[PDB]
Design a protein around this motif. Structure first.
Motif, short mmCIF file in Angstrom:
data_model
loop_
_atom_site.label_atom_id
_atom_site.label_comp_id
_atom_site.label_asym_id
_atom_site.label_seq_id
_atom_site.Cartn_x
_atom_site.Cartn_y
_atom_site.Cartn_z
N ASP A 141 19.94 -41.00 11.37
CA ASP A 141 19.24 -40.24 10.34
C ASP A 141 20.14 -39.20 9.68
O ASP A 141 20.18 -39.08 8.45
N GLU A 197 12.89 -43.59 9.79
CA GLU A 197 14.22 -43.52 10.38
C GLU A 197 15.22 -44.32 9.55
O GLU A 197 14.86 -45.34 8.96
N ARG A 217 21.07 -43.33 19.52
CA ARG A 217 20.08 -42.33 19.17
C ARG A 217 20.41 -40.92 19.69
O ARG A 217 19.57 -40.03 19.58
N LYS A 262 19.53 -36.83 14.67
CA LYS A 262 18.26 -37.49 14.36
C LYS A 262 17.27 -36.49 13.72
O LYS A 262 17.36 -35.27 13.95
N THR A 282 13.94 -37.75 13.60
CA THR A 282 12.74 -38.36 14.14
C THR A 282 12.97 -38.69 15.61
O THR A 282 14.10 -39.10 15.99
#
Ligand SMILES: [Cu+2]
Ligand SMILES: [Cu+2]
Length: 464
Positions: free
Chosen positions: A231, A250, A414, A418, A420
């Motif tokens: 993101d 995302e 991830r 980020k 989200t």
């Protein structure tokens, strides 16, 4: 399949450092049937606004709809004044201008409406665009960069249509519980398009712009995806995967190999999420067809992409609890309407307008839940313990670091930047820092990005 993938125009600043976006109704054709659609600078979807870190632009936004809308830059670290949440009203026929001074690394972000109580409808009707944030560092990497040839945005969305062809949107007891989802999959607006990509590396900027539907990208022949970005931008190094789950709103950037003359599809795999496994999404579903061509591409996959800051020490950091809940009566009726309509297939793997909540309170746009610190890391604990629905939780004003995603350390692709984090019957922790201010008249939102949850209460406002 036959139609080529539409390519959003890469919109840059003019001679006065200005960019114009017009918000308008138009028409599109889906499988031979015309439908009223909404778009930015067009009939449907919108351009990819291109920005350079440390360089300021003014955006002149014209609402040419006949209802109110707002324009939010999802992923952008800007003050609450230009952030365009529910309080950022642009009246129909009216013009509002916002100055953006981009101060974060290269990343694919996006923009979309944030109208109070109606954001789900306005995105469903067609409003979304991209933001290509560039910096000095990323241009040194020699990644694929020919926009619309070997560097292509891929905005994936589902839609439901009436017998008359019109987008069939509704915010009712069913969709308030499980979200609005459809049977037709769209890729930059087109149903199953084709893209000619040259031999070597193809760069795809993936955005899940569905209201409520989670996706999971792979390739039809199972060639790998090399994830280079999340993101908030570049990962430290590539992370090589066979499949890529993506939550509503995302973005990931991936390089995929275009190595022989053999075509392959980009696909989405079935997810276990309530409502989302009904035919034709019970099986792998094509997203787009990649068609090799021999024309020139010198794009590269670096070993090493970036270096990200370290996770701070947790001690002394402020901790904020956000308890997501749903009224159980929405839950019930919601799943019952879902059962009625579709049946057993729906399970493969009282005002409902204020029924969804955070900390026991449906969104009230007048009362910010708290003041968050400026330029100081905080630790936010978001819990969805108490129901079984998916809640991609999103925080305006920030790119954060996930410490814990739904009961586990985050996956390697991830653990970078980020905006989200997944919340589904478990608890997530993130390390958030706000570098810009947001007064109570123009507060940042924290909310579920399952848009029908957002619109019925699952959002709070906060200041910095
Ligand atoms: Cu946002
Ligand atoms: Cu939710």
């Amino acid at each position: 399949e036959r139609p080529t993938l539409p390519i959003p125009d890469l919109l840059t600043t003019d001679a006065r450092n200005r960019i114009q976006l017009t918000i308008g109704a138009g028409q599109s054709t889906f499988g031979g049937k015309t439908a009223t659609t909404w778009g930015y600078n067009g009939n449907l979807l919108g351009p990819a606004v291109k920005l350079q870190r440390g360089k300021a632009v003014t955006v002149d936004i014209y609402n040419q709809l006949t209802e109110e809308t707002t324009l939010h830059w999802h992923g952008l670290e800007v003050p609450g004044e230009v952030d365009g949440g529910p309080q950022g009203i642009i009246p129909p026929g009216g013009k509002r201008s916002v100055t953006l001074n981009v101060d974060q690394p290269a990343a694919t972000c996006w923009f979309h409406p944030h109208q109070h109580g109606k954001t789900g409808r306005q995105v469903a009707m067609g409003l979304a665009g991209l933001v290509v944030i560039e910096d000095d560092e990323i241009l040194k990497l020699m990644l694929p960069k020919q926009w619309g040839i070997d560097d292509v945005p891929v905005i994936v969305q589902d839609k439901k249509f009436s017998a008359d062809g019109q987008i069939d949107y509704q915010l009712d007891v069913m969709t308030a519980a499980v979200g609005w989802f459809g049977d037709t999959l769209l890729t930059n607006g087109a149903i199953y398009p084709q893209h000619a990509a040259p031999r070597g590396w193809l760069r795809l900027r993936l955005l899940n712009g569905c209201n409520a539907r989670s996706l999971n990208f792979a390739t039809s022949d199972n060639r790998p995806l090399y994830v280079i970005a999340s993101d908030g931008g570049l990962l430290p190094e590539p992370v090589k995967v066979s499949e890529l789950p993506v939550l509503m709103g995302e973005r990931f950037e991936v390089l995929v190999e275009v190595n022989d003359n053999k075509p392959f599809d980009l696909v989405t795999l079935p997810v276990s999420q309530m409502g989302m496994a009904i035919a034709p999404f019970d099986k792998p579903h094509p997203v787009m067809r990649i068609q090799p061509i021999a024309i020139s591409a010198s794009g590269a996959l670096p070993d090493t992409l970036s270096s990200l800051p370290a996770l701070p020490s947790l001690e002394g950091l402020t901790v904020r609890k956000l308890q997501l809940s749903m009224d159980p009566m929405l839950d019930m009726m919601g799943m019952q309407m879902l059962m009625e309509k579709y049946g057993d297939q729906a399970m493969a793997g009282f005002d409902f307008h204020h029924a969804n909540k955070i900390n026991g309170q449906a969104f009230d746009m007048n009362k910010p839940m708290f003041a968050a610190a400026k330029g100081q890391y905080e630790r936010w604990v978001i819990s969805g313990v108490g129901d079984m629905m998916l809640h991609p939780f999103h925080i305006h004003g920030t790119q954060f670091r996930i410490l814990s995603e739904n009961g586990k350390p985050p996956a390697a692709h991830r653990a970078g930047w980020k905006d989200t984090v997944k919340v589904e019957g478990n608890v997530s922790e993130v390390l958030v820092k706000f570098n810009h201010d947001a007064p109570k008249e123009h507060a940042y939102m924290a909310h579920c990005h399952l848009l029908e949850h957002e619109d019925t209460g699952m959002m709070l406002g906060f200041t910095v």
